[PDB]
Symmetry: D2
């Protein structure tokens, strides 16, 4: 038996709670990228992600981090901070696309997430929402940035989908018009977006049940 558990708060999982009526609205995907370079492969990859997601039927919003103050260097009502926070609240899933800069995710990528709180009043800007992580680099393949982002996804309490993208030697993959050529990298991008839409459709309607936790029911009681 279970002498450390409160049997009043323990609940058997309920199949019907996992299957509420399917929503019909476009899955809401926020896309963030980690560069302000004029020629930014992370931005250009974010845009390829957008085109795919839109094809699949998602409503996509891409946040431009230009003009974002450093965390705590402005009030939370700053135009770009409010935009980012409202975008996160609006989202049902997110794509984060970071350059790998000095073998890690970028300060721009992390500063965006730094500005997003786990909670504000009753609202949880990220909890339970789906996440796809992707990186790009001018050098040979690495996973340092996507590893950091996947751990970060846990801290934000997101459902980080298993598939992810790491594009090596990015300048070889994007043409003069900023479009990705057919490649194994591109096929991965398609798989990741494809998976993200499926996970978002699967989880969004029962997310409140999925985050209805024993410990929180216990503290309410």
């Amino acid at each position: 038996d279970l002498p450390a558990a409160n049997l009043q708060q323990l609940r058997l999982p309920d199949s019907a709670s996992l299957r509420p009526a399917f929503s019909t609205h476009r899955p809401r995907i926020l896309i963030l990228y980690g560069s302000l370079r004029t020629v930014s492969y992370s931005r250009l990859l974010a845009e390829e992600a957008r085109r795919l997601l839109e094809f699949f039927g998602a409503e996509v919003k891409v946040f431009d981090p230009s003009g974002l103050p450093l965390p705590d260097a402005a009030p939370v009502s700053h135009p770009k901070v409010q935009e980012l926070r409202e975008l996160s609240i609006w989202s049902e899933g997110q794509v984060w696309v970071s350059p790998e800069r000095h073998g890690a995710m970028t300060g721009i990528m992390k500063a965006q997430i730094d500005w997003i709180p786990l909670s504000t009043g009753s609202i949880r800007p990220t909890q339970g929402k789906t996440l796809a992580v992707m990186q790009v680099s001018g050098g040979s393949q690495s996973f340092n940035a996507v590893n950091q982002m996947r751990i970060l996804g846990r801290w934000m309490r997101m459902i980080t989908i298993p598939n992810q993208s790491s594009v090596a030697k990015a300048f070889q993959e994007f043409d003069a018009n900023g479009r990705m050529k057919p490649s194994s990298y591109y096929d991965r991008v398609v798989d990741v977006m494809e998976e993200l839409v499926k996970f978002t459709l699967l989880t969004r309607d029962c997310s409140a049940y999925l985050t209805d936790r024993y410990s929180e029911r216990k503290e309410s009681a």
Copy 2:
């Protein structure tokens, strides 16, 4: 906006029907792996509390005893402990991995079990698409080094690693003389993690094949 790099014959729209086939009626199958061979092992004792909770939640639970598991490539694959582990992984729909944190990392014993499990053995994918909960136990103050490592490892195994996780600090203090976890914030988190695992397993097991039906695979198949 156009998609000149895509194979437009294999690119398909999401299908809602496919995310909701009829629910299976058999108990969710959960395999629990733990990362220590010590006689009194807090990871094993935590594994056992996980088992108890998962059973209450209606899962069929199996726990693998790693005692006698050879080092990876130190024995043939047909070694009994290897075959048993592989069979157990195949059988499972979701898993719990419970690792001590030793020298600020997951244990050699934990990693060795996962190293013995291949992504593909013939037509069978022992781990792909299955849910995963990660937990660690430590003799010292809080760290998440082991669970962070196991979470990255979950990606490499193509598992749906649930967001919640448990890290029990100074674990020796949290277990009584009967090997039972004491009531605490840590225990309530173990409840939450097991609760979450069952929900995600129920949610995903029946549409896993659709979730894992990939553009790049169809393209290569055509």
Copy 3:
């Protein structure tokens, strides 16, 4: 056992004398960077406690204020805060990085500062071979995610990252009303880290060029010379 893949002409037996040139006689030059712009910032307060210790150990210390630093690539490198940062990095012989743990990771402000520092600017290497101590602070229970990330980043900056480090848990509990760190195991550790950083910087600063004199670079330089001469039609 021979070395068929090695260019024997660029191989060098490590030379003990070269690891001991005359000691420098100026104060070890330490740059401190921190990862918060909060009014009450425990990383900044920790940075200042680190400065006092370093100065007691005889270092010359400069602390960079990241306020007004543009986002990487959001301004020309001639931006006054960017020049300041790069100039301080070039000046430094060792560094301390003090990051909060925000969302379980090093902070965007911490990483943005390093993002603004190139491995190379012409012949100048702003970070290579220099010593580094990493430290973190958190509002919550202990973690090492942030110091772990910084330790890897120190490799990528080609720094000699010292084995010891500080992670202060529930940092608000450990600083008093004057912003001074209270006596504790955590403080004793900060002392050990600063003591260690100064020893490594003294040990290493004078022979850095030798430590950083690499086979593959001697091999490349030789190939490049030969190529340049050939392009000018010299037999």
Copy 4:
């Protein structure tokens, strides 16, 4: 000297002379550990290339064979393969760790070997203050996951992990039929890593007791 949290008796100013003791003459003792027991193992062949380089550079090199090593706690600290390993570690002044990347991480074999090495065994510190070079091999395209994990592990072992490291992608392409590594930028990196490890080990081995001498420990 505005240091109120500090016990001013335990504080010493750094001593330049204590960083420069008479140089040792004996050859630098390096232990190599590898993370694969496969018949054809590129971490083992890489480990052997490391050995040849370090010997040329004037190190005395020992390589531990992890075969027959029991799993941790599956045998007493006295298991013969255990006695062998702790001691090779106690003998070494620096170490090379060479792990495959398996499932995007260092191997169980690599981890099990260091799990078996305590921070202390009474008064000896098999690892504290010793130098460390980390290297990985993969069958796939480049990654740093295994060397990243090993670098953090070097911190937990209190070692001086040198900045330079090796990661060899598609390692099967880089070794010929005789098990020798082919000339390449990967090989040139290996040379650099070994060269650096020898320099660091000569630099630090004599003043280690001074370097590992702490305010906190002599306060306690």
